């Protein structure tokens, strides 16, 4: 074991040297050309009320009109954000839902949490209501995040330090992704849905090729647990939020951190993260009940989405960049512009 | 306009159901249950039941519904799945008082300290079930206990005058059990600030009064929360 430890240390030193060699110029020294965007004075356009408990998760629809929200009151409520109307209200068998998903086709939602089971619900039944279409068991820890690739395949992250790619029709893990030491808190599919980055409670993110089932790259730099993660919209970078009150943008093709977003006044972690359509803004929800919009290129905060009465647990930006949504533990969703 | 009418009627049909479910959500008290498996926790669950990543127990006292959430098939790192349990009425923390991991009791002390000072659990009360009082009594009566080797402050600790020993209890038993309770209360009182309260109890795995203890503690918690709303506490 001593020889393997020494080889691991040598490989880590080699990787550090390789990362340092290609890091002659930082992001700011080049983005000084890019002009600042100024204050981003967004306002709450809609307030979605109906959840009786903290809304742990929320996901948009590809149409940028419908969205699904998951709450500890065990309700998966589907809101038409345009008219504030509720489209469906799924009672959950497990109240502790810590994640939810909306399929790209929109036919299926999903939910998971402390029950270790990822439940897939169908919104397009013959009756027209929503029932328990499928149950995907096989995780030995709490579900933290899940993402649909299609109507048949869904990728999930658990509290057992591993991710799992599920074939919905059969119910078996098409793939199992292992390599993290801490609990995996979030994941995000690439725009081409071929790679996905998962952040864990080891202060590290891992980029997995979905077809191979192997970890392509490991990105470090965070100091505490990583709570949320999301790709840059171009698909060749991503962002992470952690308990050390720093957001961190990495790039896959350089393997090393591009930018960090933190302030001295911020002493609370980032619980949710989501890029805008342009990739020029980065919306991060914080434990101090606020959500901040960061100028992802200039690394300075662009604005504050003040108005939430408790911890902001989740966010979501529309595909067309029309509107933002933020859930919270105040049981209120807020649609922002 | 037809689509808007259909959407509005569906939203009304959903909102009536949400109004119906709000009553049952507000009328049911959710309890977290925490502690090691060797501390008699599972026996407490069995006692409350006779009378998967998480296990539920639905019981009721005086027509009041209690929904207790035992944890199973989860990892030992609680720092991320504990934050889901702040809205609960209370955290029933079960301790093996006789288990002083050669020092399991110190592990319980540190876990309780972390729970007490967690920023999301700083408004959640803790009901403390020191569950191995009988085993502690057997250990201290036989003289092989010698809690001094595991806690030096046991010699200079003097039993408070407010202690209420059981009838027919060896004063060493009472002194040891109140020493452990005061070791917990040292953390509980410090950095408490009245936003959440600890309710140390001397329980046993086969007690029938555990449900009544939880009932009274939850009632007291709700009362004190209402008094904090009116700025009376």
């Amino acid at each position, epitope marked *: 074991l001593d020889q393997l430890r020494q080889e691991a240390e040598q490989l880590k030193n080699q990787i550090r040297d390789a990362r340092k060699a290609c890091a002659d110029a930082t992001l700011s020294q080049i983005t000084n050309n890019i002009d600042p965007v100024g204050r981003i004075q967004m306002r709450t356009r809609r307030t979605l009320r109906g959840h009786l408990a903290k809304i742990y998760a929320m996901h948009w629809g590809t149409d940028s009109r419908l969205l699904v929200s998951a709450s500890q009151d065990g309700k998966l409520i589907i809101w038409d954000s345009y008219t504030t109307n509720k489209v469906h209200a799924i009672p959950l068998r497990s109240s502790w839902v810590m994640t939810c998903a909306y399929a790209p086709s929109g036919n299926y939602v999903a939910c998971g949490g402390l029950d270790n089971i990822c439940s897939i619900y169908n919104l397009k039944t013959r009756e027209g209501n929503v029932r328990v279409s499928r149950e995907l068991a096989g995780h030995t820890g709490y579900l933290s995040c899940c993402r649909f690739l299609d109507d048949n395949q869904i990728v999930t992250s658990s509290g057992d330090t591993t991710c799992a790619l599920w074939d919905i029709e059969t119910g078996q893990q098409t793939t199992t992704f292992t390599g993290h030491t801490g609990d995996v808190m979030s994941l995000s599919l690439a725009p081409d849905t071929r790679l996905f980055v998962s952040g864990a409670c080891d202060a590290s993110a891992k980029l997995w090729d979905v077809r191979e089932g192997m970890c392509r790259q490991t990105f470090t730099g965070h100091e505490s647990d990583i709570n949320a993660i999301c790709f840059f919209p171009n698909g060749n970078a991503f962002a992470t939020g952690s308990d050390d009150a720093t957001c961190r943008l990495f790039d896959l093709r350089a393997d090393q951190e591009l930018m960090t977003y933190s302030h001295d006044n911020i002493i609370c*972690g980032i619980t949710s993260v989501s890029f805008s359509k342009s990739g020029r803004l980065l919306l991060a929800g914080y434990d101090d009940f606020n959500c901040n919009v960061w100028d992802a290129l200039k690394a300075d905060r662009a604005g504050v989405l003040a108005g939430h009465d408790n911890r902001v647990s989740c966010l979501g930006v529309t595909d067309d960049g029309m509107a933002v949504a933020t859930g919270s533990w105040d049981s209120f969703l807020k649609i922002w512009n | 306009r037809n689509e808007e009418k259909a959407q509005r009627e569906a939203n009304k049909k959903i909102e009536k159901q949400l109004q119906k479910d709000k009553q049952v959500y507000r009328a049911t008290h959710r309890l977290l249950l925490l502690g090691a498996g060797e501390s008699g926790k599972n026996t407490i669950v069995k006692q409350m039941r006779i009378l998967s990543g998480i296990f539920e127990t639905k019981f009721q006292v005086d027509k009041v519904n209690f929904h207790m959430f035992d944890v199973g098939a989860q990892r030992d790192e609680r720092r991320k799945w504990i934050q889901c349990f702040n809205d609960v009425t209370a955290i029933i923390f079960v301790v093996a008082s006789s288990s002083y991991q050669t020092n399991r009791l110190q592990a319980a002390l540190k876990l309780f300290d972390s729970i007490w000072n967690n920023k999301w659990l700083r408004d959640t009360s803790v009901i403390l079930f020191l569950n191995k009082q009988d085993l502690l009594a057997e250990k201290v009566l036989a003289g092989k206990s010698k809690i001094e080797d595991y806690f030096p402050e046991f010699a200079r600790y003097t039993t408070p005058e407010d202690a209420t020993p059981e009838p027919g209890e060896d004063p060493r038993v009472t002194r040891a059990k109140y020493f452990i309770r005061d070791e917990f209360l040292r953390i509980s009182t410090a950095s408490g600030d009245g936003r959440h309260y600890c309710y140390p109890h001397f329980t046993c795995a086969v007690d029938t009064e555990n449900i009544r203890r939880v009932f009274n503690d939850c009632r007291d918690i709700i009362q004190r929360m209402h008094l904090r709303q009116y700025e009376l506490l």
Partner: nanobody, 126 residues
Framework: QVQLQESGGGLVQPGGSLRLSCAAS????????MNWVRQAPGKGLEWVSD????????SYTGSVKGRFTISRDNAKNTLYLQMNSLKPEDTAVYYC?????????????????????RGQGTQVTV
């Protein structure tokens, strides 16, 4: 990456003295509470001592009170444990843990079976 490397462990006769040093790299030492934990041969992880951010607040387990002394040099980003009057039941692997989140009073999962922010440990045989 979070790196905690221990040194100073070794073989000592009962009643001897020793000094465990913990070098921390990859994080801001002054903002995290730090803990000394130990695993005895054939037993689970046990918590030995903890010290707060600035070092003002210090706590020890019962079995090491008076004997050992925890401290931390924030300028050198290191954690010290002065071992005095050692006993044969003090033989164990000593890991230098870190609290999971900064600025927070509570430390969770320092004595967990797989903790991501804990050192590799140093053997102390008495």
């Amino acid at each position: 990456q979070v790196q905690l490397q221990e040194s100073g462990g070794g073989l000592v006769q009962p009643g001897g003295s020793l000094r465990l040093s913990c070098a921390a790299s990859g994080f801001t030492f002054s903002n995290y509470k730090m803990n000394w934990v130990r695993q005895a041969p054939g037993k689970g992880l046990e918590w030995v001592s903890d010290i707060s951010q600035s070092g003002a607040s210090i706590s020890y387990t019962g079995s090491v009170k008076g004997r050992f002394t925890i401290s931390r040099d924030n300028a050198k980003n290191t954690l010290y444990l002065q071992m005095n009057s050692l006993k044969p039941e003090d033989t164990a692997v000593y890991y230098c843990a870190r609290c999971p989140a900064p600025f927070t009073r509570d430390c969770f999962d320092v004595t967990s079976t797989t903790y991501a922010y804990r050192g590799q440990g140093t053997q102390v045989t008495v």
